[PDB]
Design goal:
The structure is cut from a larger assembly and holds five copies of chain A. The first copy, chain A, is of the alpha/beta class. Chain A has two domains: about 1-155, 3-Layer(aba) Sandwich (Rossmann fold); about 155-365, Dehydroquinate synthase-like - alpha domain (Dehydroquinate synthase-like, alpha domain, Up-down Bundle). The first copy, chain A, has helices at about 20-25, 35-55, 65-80, 90-105, 150-155, 160-180, 195-220, 225-245, 250-255, 270-280, 285-300, 315-325, 340-360; strands spanning about 1-5, 10-15, 30-35, 55-60, 85-90, 110, 125-130, 135-140, 145-150. Chain A has a six-stranded parallel beta sheet, with helices on both faces. Chain A is globular and about 60 Å long. At the A-B interface, strand 1, strand 2, helix 7 and helix 8 of A face strand 1, strand 2, helix 7 and helix 8 of B. Strand 1 (about 5) of chain C pairs antiparallel with strand 2 of chain D, so a sheet runs across the interface. Bound molecules: sodium ion (5 copies) and zinc ion (10 copies). One zinc ion binds near residues 30, 59, 80, 81 and 82 of chain D.
C-alpha cells in the first residue's frame, strides 16, 4: 500500500493570526489556548480578538517551558468544558498541544511563531531524555486538524531560526529519495506515493531557489514572496515529505549526535544539515551535488564541519559513539537502499568533515 | 492573500487494499453504515465486510438507490441514527460517494470513501457537483471538510472498463492547465485562498504523470492487470488531480464542460471526456503555442479522448449551440473568470470552434 | 548614416474597434469626409456613422468609384472642400485606402484608415503602389507623412475570406528577409535612412509571429471567429510588416513581385501570393541554407501560398518569360539592388527557375 | 483594444543636427526655437544654418532653466507668427517645447542634447512640486512630430547622463512584461501590442549587449555603433516600451523616493534603476536574473543599495513612507499582476538593499 | 570571378633545411643564395650540403640588412648565370629574393628562419618610406614557387617573434570575413573562394587552440605538434587567407599607426593585433568575442592598450592622424561592409584602448 497523510488544512500568510477565528470556528466553538507568556504577549490580543469576532469561546492556560504538564492541562480543559486545543509558539508548546488534544480526543489547531523544524504538520513528536539524548519517535494516530503560519510573525523571529528550519528541510529530498529507492515504509505506514516524494523534491528545489533571498528578507524583519516560499518549504513541503515519504540516514545521524554533550547548543535543523552532508558521503553522491549542498549551507550559515558543531580535537572515538547510536535497531538509517554499519557511518561523518573543511579553505 | 491547502486525512492505494480497509477504518470508528448499490455489494461486499469483521469493526449494509438526492440522503441519515453507527463507508461510483459525503456531513461523522472506478478527481474533495434532472450543471456544493480517508484498490480499478480510466485521465488532464491559469491570475481556489506551491506542483505532476504513464497504464488495464504505470495513473487521476483542482483552482476547462451540459447531444459522454475537449478549448483561449496543442492532441488521440465537436456528438451548423455553450460557461460565478485575462462568450465560442478545427486537421494527418 | 523610423501616429486594433472609432477620430478633427464603396458602406456604414455621431463627429459619406486615379482623387477633393470637412476617413480595401491617403495629402488634412481586410502591409505606410491599367508595376508613390491613425477591427477581418488573410501573411512573410538583407547591405529604406534596430526587430517579430500563429489564425478565420492568434496575425500583417518594410527596407522579393507583373498568367493572383513566391526566390538568390528553405516551403504549403511557377499559372517553356521577369526586377531604381551583393537578370532568372524546382520537389514528398 | 502610438519620425545619427532643416521643412516653414544659452552656444549655428539652407524661417527665444514660461513663450510665438516649435536641450526645455506646441496646436520637433531619460518620444510630461516630489503624469493628446538625436553631441555630454538614461531604460522590459501579464492598460490607452512589448524587450537586451561598450566610448567622447544602439535603446525603444506597453512598480517606487530629501541629488534614471531592483524582489524574480541586473548596474555605475542612494542609518520608517507613496491610488504599481500593499513594497526595497550590499561584498 | 592563388609548394617540418635540395632540384639546377652573415652561419652548411647532395649548383651572395641592392644582386646573378633564387632569413631578405627573382624571371624558393608575418607565401611586398611610414603594397604577378619552413630553426628564434607572427595571423579571419560580407575584391583579384575564407577561419581557430601551447614550447626552444600548427597558421593559413580572401580595417589601422614615431619599436604583428581589436569595435563585435581576443592577446603578450604600444598621455590628436591615414583613398579599410570615416576609426581605436585597459584592471 502507498499511503499519504496530511493535516486537514494548512493556512499561510501575513497576518494569518487575525483570520484564525473563521477556520477554527469550523472545528469547534470553544478552545483551550496553550501559550507561554511571551507568545501570549505578542499574539494573544490578535488571536483572542479573532476568536471573539467569530463567536468562538476561549480560555487561555498558564503555560511554562512532561506527561504531567500534559495531564494538568488535560484536567483544566475538562474543568472549563473545552471542545478544542490551540497551541501557539515554538515546538515544546505545539508538542504539548498535540498531546493534550490526543489524550482528550479533540481537534487541534497549531500556530507556530517560528519556522524552525518540519514537526508541526506531522502526527509525531520526538521525545528526548533529561540529558538531551534522542529517546523515541512518538506517533499519534491523527495529524493536526489545522496549521496556521503567520508569515509576519515568523519573519520577525531571529533569522537563525529560519536558517535552522532550512537545515531541517534540506534533508527531506535526500531522505525521501533514499527511502523511495529502498522501498522503505514511511511513518505514514506504507510505501511513498508520488505525491510525497515530489513535495520532498520541491522542498529542496525551493531552498536552492529561495533560501538566500528569504534569509536577507528575514534579516530586515520583512515578508517577501521568497519568505512565504521558504516558510511553506520548511513546514508543509518538508512535513509531508518526511512523514509520508520517509526518514533515513540524516535524521539517524542527528539522533546519534545527541549522545555528545558538545552539540547540545545547536538547533535540531543545524545538526540535520550536517547529517545530510554525512548521508551524501554514505550514499556516494557525486562531487557536484556535494558542492551544491556545501555552498548552500555555507551561504545561509549551516554547519559544514565538526568544529562548527563544537566538536574539536581528535573526534574519532566520539564519532564512533555517534555512529553506534545512529545504527541502533529501529533507527531510520536502515531505510537506506544498502546495508549500513557503524564503521560506514563513522567514515561518512569524518569524511564529510574533511570535505567541509577543504571547502572552507577554498572560500 | 492567505495560501491554503486542504486534504483528506489519509489516502491509501494499492492492489487488494479493500481487504485491508478494516485496520484503517478502525482508527476512526468501530461502527459503520456501508452505503453501496447492489452491483457493488456483489462485487466488493464479502471482501470489505470480511476485513471489517476481522478488525472488530461493526457494520450495517445499506442499499443505495442509485441517485444522490436529498430524499435518499435524509433516508440514509435516519437509518444510521437507528442502528447507532459512528461512521459512514461509501463504496462504488460517484453518486454513491457523493451520497456518503453528505450523510457523514449531516450526521457529523467520519467518512471512508472506496471508489471502485478512477474516472473523476471528485473522491478526495470537500465537494459534490449538482446537476438538474435534465443533466444540466446546477452548482458546486462545498462541505466544510474533506473525507477522512480515501481507499483505492488498484486490482478492482484495473478490472473496470478501460473507458472509465481514460475518462479519469481526461479529467486529470485539465488539472495543470487550470491550476496554472489560476496561479497566474492570483485566483482564489475552492480551499478559500491563493494556491500553495504544493497544490500547483501536484497539479503539474498530474500532467507529467499522464504523459509518461497514460498509454502504458491504458494497455495494462485493457489486459485487466495492475502494473506500476497503472498505480501511477490511479494516483494521478485521484490524489494529484483532486488536490490540484480543489486547492489550486478551476478555470476555463471545467466552465466549458459545464457549458456543454446545456446540449442534449453530449449529455451521456463521461465527465472526463468532455473536460478533455474543454482543456483543448482552454489552450486556444489562452493561446498556447502549437507544440503544446500538438502534445495534448496526440495524448488525447492516443488514449481515446475527444478532440472534435463531432466526437462529442455535435454536427452541422453548431454556431448557435456553441454560443449557448459559451454563454453558460461565462455565467456569473463560473470558474472561467479565474483566467488571467478577461473572457467573454464570444471569445469562448471562438476558442471552441477553433479547437474543433485544430483537432479535425490533426485527425486528417492521423498523427 | 542617419537611422530613421517613421510611423502612423496611432494604431488601434481589436474586435469591434469600428464601434469605438469616434473617440479616436474626434481627437484629430470634428468633421470628416468618409470614403467607402457601396459594399463597404452596407457592411460597416451604420456602425461607423453611429460611432461618429455618438462622439459629436460630423460626417459626409462619399461613394468611392472603385479606382485610385487622379480623376477620382481630384473629384473627392472638390467634394470635401464644398462641405468644409476637416479630415478624411478611408474604409475598405487597398484602393479605397490609397485614395483616402491622397485626398488627405492634397487637402493637407488628417486621415484615419479603416482596413476591412488584412491582405497587405500598405495601410500604415506613407506610400501607394501605382500600376498601369494593364496591371504592370509603375512606381512607388511616396507621401511626406504616414496616416495619422489606422484602425483594425478584428471581428470584421475574421469574417472576410481566409484567402485574403493568407495573402497578407504572404506579404508579411517577405518582411524579415528583405529587412535583414537591407540591413546587411546598409541600404537606405523608404523612410530615408539606414534601418533602426527597432524596424529590423519588428520585421523579425513579423516572421516569428507568422511561424507561431499563422496556422492557428487561419483555422480560426476559416471558422469566422477571432482568437488571440488571429489578433497576432492581424498585427503582424499590418503594423509589424508595415513598419518593417517602410523603415527597414525592401529588396529582392518585392522587386521579383514587380517583375512578375509583366506576365498575364499571374495578373489576377493577390499581391501577397506573388510576394510569397518572390520570397522563395530571394532565398535561393542569397543562398539560404536548406533548413531555412524547408521552413518556408512548409509554412507556405501549410497555409496555402504558392511554391511553384505552376501555382502561379506559369507553365511550359517559361525560359523567356522568366528572363523578362528577371529584367524587369533588375530595372534601375528597383529594390533588388538593396541586396548585399551584386544582382544581375541572369542571377534572378536562376533563382526563380531554381525556386520552382525546389517547391516542385517539396510537393512530391508532400511534406 | 491594443493601441500603439509613436512620434511621426525618429532620426538619429552623428551630426544629425546639420540635417535638421530637410525634415523640419516638411512640417513647417517657420519655427520658434527654444533653447538655453549654453545649448544655443553649442548647437545654434549648426541648427540655424541647416534651417536657412532649406528655406526655413526661425526666431530664437531667450530661455532659462512653470505654466508661465510656457505662456510667455506662447505669446512670443503668436507675436512673430511662428508655425512650429523646436526644443533643443535637456528635459525641462523639451517639456516646455511640448507644452508650447500643444497649447498653440503646432508641430514640434525635439532635439535632445543628452540621452538621460526616455521622455522625449512620449506624449507625457512628469510634473513635480516645488520641493521635488512627484505630482502627476500630464498626458498630451499627441506625441511629438519629430525627435532628432545627434549622437556626436550626446557622446560629448557627461557619461554620468548616458548611465542615467540606461537606468531609466533598464526598467522598461520589466515594467512592460508585468503590465502585459496583468493585462494592464498603457498610457497609450489600450492593452499592449506585440510590437511595444517586443521593443521593451529589445531595450533590455540591447543594454546588456551594448551598455559597457557604449559607456567606454562616451568616456572618450566618441561615437561607435554601441553608442548609437544605446542612444536608440534609451530613447526610441524605451520610450515606445514605456508609453505603449506600460509602467509598473519601478516607476511607482521612483515616485515614492521623491518624498525623501536624501535622494534629490540622483538623476531620475539612477533612482528608476534601484526601483527596478526592488520590483525584481516584489515579483520574486529568480536569483540568476537578480544577479544579471546587479552586475549590469554595478558595471555601469547605477545604485544597488540605499547607501548609494544617500539613505543611511535605520531607513525603516523612511522606506515605509516611500512605500505608502508608491502605492497611492492612481499609481502604476497597481498594474503589477498581483496585489501590492505598502508593507510588500517596503519589504521589497529593504530586501533589495540587502541583496545589493551582499553583492558589493562579493565584488 | 572567384580567384585563389598559392605558392606552388609549401613544405614544413623539423630539419626541413636538410631536405631542400630534393625540392629545389625540381625547379632548377643552379641557384643564387641570398642570406645575411648571421643566417649563413646558422643555415649555410646545412643548406649548401643539401644542394650538393642533389646535384644543385650554388653561389652565395654577400647580403646586408632598396631597388639598388636588388639591382646589384640582379647583375651578380647574370654574371654567374644562375637559374634560380633562394632567400634565407627574415623579411627583408625574403622580399629582396622575391624582387630579384621577379626582375630576372626565375623561380624563387623562400626559407624563413622566423615565423613573424604571413608575407612569405604571398605575391606581395609592403614598401615603407625611409621614416618607417607605410608607402604601398607592391604586387608581383607570381607567388613564390616554394616556401620551406624549418620548424627546428623557427622554434629556436626569440619567442617574441613567434608571438608577433600570431598577432599578424590574428587579424586574418576577421579581415577575410569582413571582405567576404562586403563582397570585396582580394589581392588575388576576384571575390573570395570558400577555400580562402575557410583557411582564414582555420587560422583563427588554430591560434585559439595552439597559441599558448606553442609559445611555451618555443620558450624552451623545442618543436611540438602545437608549434608545427602555429607555424602553419602563421604562414600558409594566414598567407592564403589574407591574399586570396582579403584585407580590411586591421591592416589599414596598422598602416595608420606607422605615421606615429612612438610605435616604430613594435613588430608588424604586434601592431596588427591592436588594429584587430580596433576593428572589433568598428564592426561592433559582441563583448564575448572582444573578451576572447583580449584574453588571447594578453595570454601570449600582444598589446591591448595604447600605452602598451608606447602611446601615452592625451592621444586624441595622434589617433586622429592614425585614423586619417587608415582611411586614405586606396586603403583596405574601405573593404569593410559598411562605410567608414576617420571619425569612426578614431572612435574605434580610443574605445579599444579603454576596453583593453578595463580588461587589464580585472586581471
Ligand atoms: Na526533514
Ligand atoms: Na481536474
Ligand atoms: Na512586406
Ligand atoms: Na522606462
Ligand atoms: Na593577416
Ligand atoms: Zn474551555
Ligand atoms: Zn528534522
Ligand atoms: Zn449501524
Ligand atoms: Zn472534473
Ligand atoms: Zn464634410
Ligand atoms: Zn507587399
Ligand atoms: Zn516666429
Ligand atoms: Zn523613467
Ligand atoms: Zn650562379
Ligand atoms: Zn600583416
Amino acid at each position: 500500500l502507498r499511503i499519504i497523510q496530511s493535516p486537514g488544512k494548512y493556512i499561510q500568510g501575513a497576518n494569518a493570526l487575525a483570520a484564525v477565528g473563521q477556520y477554527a470556528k469550523s472545528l469547534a466553538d470553544h478552545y483551550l489556548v496553550i501559550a507561554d507568556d511571551f507568545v501570549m504577549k505578542l499574539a494573544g490580543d490578535t488571536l483572542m480578538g479573532s476568536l471573539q469576532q467569530h463567536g468562538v469561546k476561549h480560555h487561555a492556560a498558564l503555560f511554562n517551558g512532561c506527561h504531567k504538564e500534559i495531564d494538568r492541562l488535560g484536567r483544566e480543559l475538562k474543568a472549563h468544558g473545552c471542545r478544542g486545543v490551540i497551541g501557539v509558539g515554538g515546538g515544546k508548546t505545539l508538542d504539548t498541544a498535540k498531546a493534550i488534544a490526543h489524550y482528550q480526543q479533540l481537534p487541534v489547531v497549531l500556530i507556530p511563531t517560528i519556522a524552525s523544524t518540519d514537526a508541526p504538520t506531522s502526527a509525531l513528536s520526538v521525545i528526548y531524555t533529561e540529558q538531551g539524548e534522542f529517546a523515541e519517535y512518538l506517533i499519534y494516530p491523527r495529524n493536526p486538524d489545522m496549521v496556521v503560519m503567520d508569515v509576519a510573525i515568523i519573519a520577525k523571529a531571529p533569522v537563525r531560526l529560519l536558517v535552522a528550519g532550512m537545515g531541517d528541510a534540506l534533508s527531506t529530498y535526500f531522505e525521501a529519495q533514499a527511502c523511495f529507492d529502498a522501498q522503505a515504509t514511511s511513518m505514514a505506514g506504507g510505501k511513498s506515493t508520488l505525491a510525497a516524494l515530489s513535495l520532498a523534491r520541491l522542498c529542496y528545489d525551493t531552498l536552492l531557489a529561495e533560501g538566500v533571498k528569504a534569509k536577507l528578507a528575514v534579516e530586515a524583519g520583512v515578508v517577501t514572496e521568497a519568505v512565504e516560499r521558504i516558510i511553506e518549504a520548511n513546514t508543509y513541503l518538508s512535513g509531508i515529505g518526511f512523514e509520508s515519504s520517509g526518514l533515513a540516514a540524516a535524521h539517524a545521524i542527528h539522533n546519534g549526535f545527541t549522545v555528545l554533550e558538545e552539540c547540545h547548543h545547536l538547533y535540531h535543523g543545524e545538526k540535520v544539515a550536517f547529517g545530510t552532508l554525512a548521508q551524501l558521503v554514505l550514499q556516494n553522491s557525486p562531487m557536484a551535488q556535494i558542492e551544491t549542498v556545501l555552498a548552500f549551507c555555507h551561504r545561509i550559515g549551516l554547519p559544514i564541519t565538526l568544529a562548527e558543531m563544537g566538536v574539536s580535537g581528535d573526534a574519532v572515538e566520539k564519532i564512533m559513539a555517534v555512529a553506534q547510536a545512529s545504527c541502533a535497531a529501529g533507527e531510520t538509517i536502515h531505510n537506506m537502499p544498502f546495508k549500513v554499519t557503524p564503521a560506514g557511518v563513522q567514515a561518512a561523518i569524518l569524511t564529510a568533515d574533511r570535505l567541509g573543511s577543504a571547502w572552507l579553505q577554498q572560500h
